[PDB]
Amino acid sequence: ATLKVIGVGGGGNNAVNRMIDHGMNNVEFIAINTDGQALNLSKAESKIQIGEKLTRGLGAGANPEIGKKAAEESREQIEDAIQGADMVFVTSGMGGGTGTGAAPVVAKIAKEMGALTVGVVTRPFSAEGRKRQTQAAAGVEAMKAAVDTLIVIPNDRLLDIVDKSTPMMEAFKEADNVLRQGVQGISDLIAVSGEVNLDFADVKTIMSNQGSALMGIGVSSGENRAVEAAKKAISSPLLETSIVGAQGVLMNITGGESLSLFEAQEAADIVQDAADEDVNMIFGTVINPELQDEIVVTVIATGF
Numbered sequence: 080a081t082l083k084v085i086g087v088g089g090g091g092n093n094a095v096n097r098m099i100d101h102g103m104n105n106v107e108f109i110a111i112n113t114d115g116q117a118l119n120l121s122k123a124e125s126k127i128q129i130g131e132k133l134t135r136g137l138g139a140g141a142n143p144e145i146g147k148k149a150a151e152e153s154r155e156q157i158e159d160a161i162q163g164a165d166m167v168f169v170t171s172g173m174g175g176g177t178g179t180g181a182a183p184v185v186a187k188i189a190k191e192m193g194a195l196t197v198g199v200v201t202r203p204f205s206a207e208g209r210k211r212q213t214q215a216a217a218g219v220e221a222m223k224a225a226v227d228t229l230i231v232i233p234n235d236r237l238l239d240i241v242d243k244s245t246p247m248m249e250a251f252k253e254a255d256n257v258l259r260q261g262v263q264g265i266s267d268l269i270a271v272s273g274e275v276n277l278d279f280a281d282v283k284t285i286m287s288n289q290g291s292a293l294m295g296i297g298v299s300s301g302e303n304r305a306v307e308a309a310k311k312a313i314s315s316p317l318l319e320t321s322i323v324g325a326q327g328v329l330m331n332i333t334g335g336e337s338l339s340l341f342e343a344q345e346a347a348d349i350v351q352d353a354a355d356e357d358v359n360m361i362f363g364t365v366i367n368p369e370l371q372d373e374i375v376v377t378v379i380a381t382g383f
């Protein structure tokens with residue numbers, strides 16, 4: 080499948096730059112912004128400046144109606160950049176003028192172009208104020224109506240994973256990992272024919288028109304490795320939507336030749352027990368002999 084990651088506005092384009100710097104192989108990046116200064120510095124191969132008639136090449140100055148109109152007026156350019164995608168991840172920080180208004184338009188276009196469309200967006204820090212939060216909430220609601228599945232990261236959760244000295248840019252990279260892991264997990268599932276295979280049609284069944292989503296990867300080794308990996312896959316502190324209530328799950332377990340039936344069952348039970356629900360299990364298994372003693376559990380959960 081052709082996977083694309085589209086960053087919309089400042090924070091979304093930040094995430095695209097950091098992900099390209101980190102390294103990401105078979106994924107096309109697209110950078111969309113009103114802010115031409117920031118776009119000029121993007122590392123993405125595909126860049127779309129939107130709304131230059133509206134903003135004269137600046138940002139949207141905290142007005143989401145300008146981000147929205149900018150995206151609508153560049154619809155054809157956005158279609159052309161998306162065309163061919165089977166799956167699109169639209170990432171954006173909600174609460175500003177460009178992302179809040181343009182990201183739901185971009186997502187709507189991607190879904191109308193036939194792409195499985197996942198939004199990964201932030202809510203602003205409480206320190207940014209109540210009206211930024213209210214503006215962001217309208218963006219989140221518009222995003223939810225425009226995507227297949229939505230992952231919301233409240234930026235306040237970053238305050239739960241730092242100490243008093245953690246550089247702000249290091250905290251931002253942690254939030255990127257939510258998107259990177261989801262993209263990488265799907266990429267890796269598509270690329271290999273598993274002993275019990277999952278492919279893009281399984282991703283579509285779990286993610287299409289399902290609302291809120293969780294995506295996680297956990298890795299462990301040694302004793303209780305499978306349970307530990309499964310718990311890590313479902314336990315991110317940054318997510319608005321936890322695993323509790325999932326009624327839809329794609330789960331893949333990858334290990335070396337030692338991967339046991341028993342421990343795969345243990346892993347499957349961890350997900351359903353934390354789900355506290357009757358959940359939609361599509362379960363896959365991959366034997367990767369180069370893994371030795373490590374196990375990797377990938378989880379996509381929906382149905383909330």
Ligand SMILES: Nc1nc2c(ncn2[C@@H]2O[C@H](COP(=O)(O)OP(=O)(O)O)[C@@H](O)[C@H]2O)c(=O)[nH]1
Pocket residue numbers: 087088089090091093094138139140141171172173174175176177178179201202203204207211234251254
């Ligand atoms: N986690 C994270 N949040 C960001 C980042 N940049 C901006 N934000 C958040 O995104 C919101 C909108 O900022 P920005 O994307 O620059 O606005 P826009 O360009 O007008 O869409 C801000 O109010 C912050 O809450 C980033 O790199 N990481």
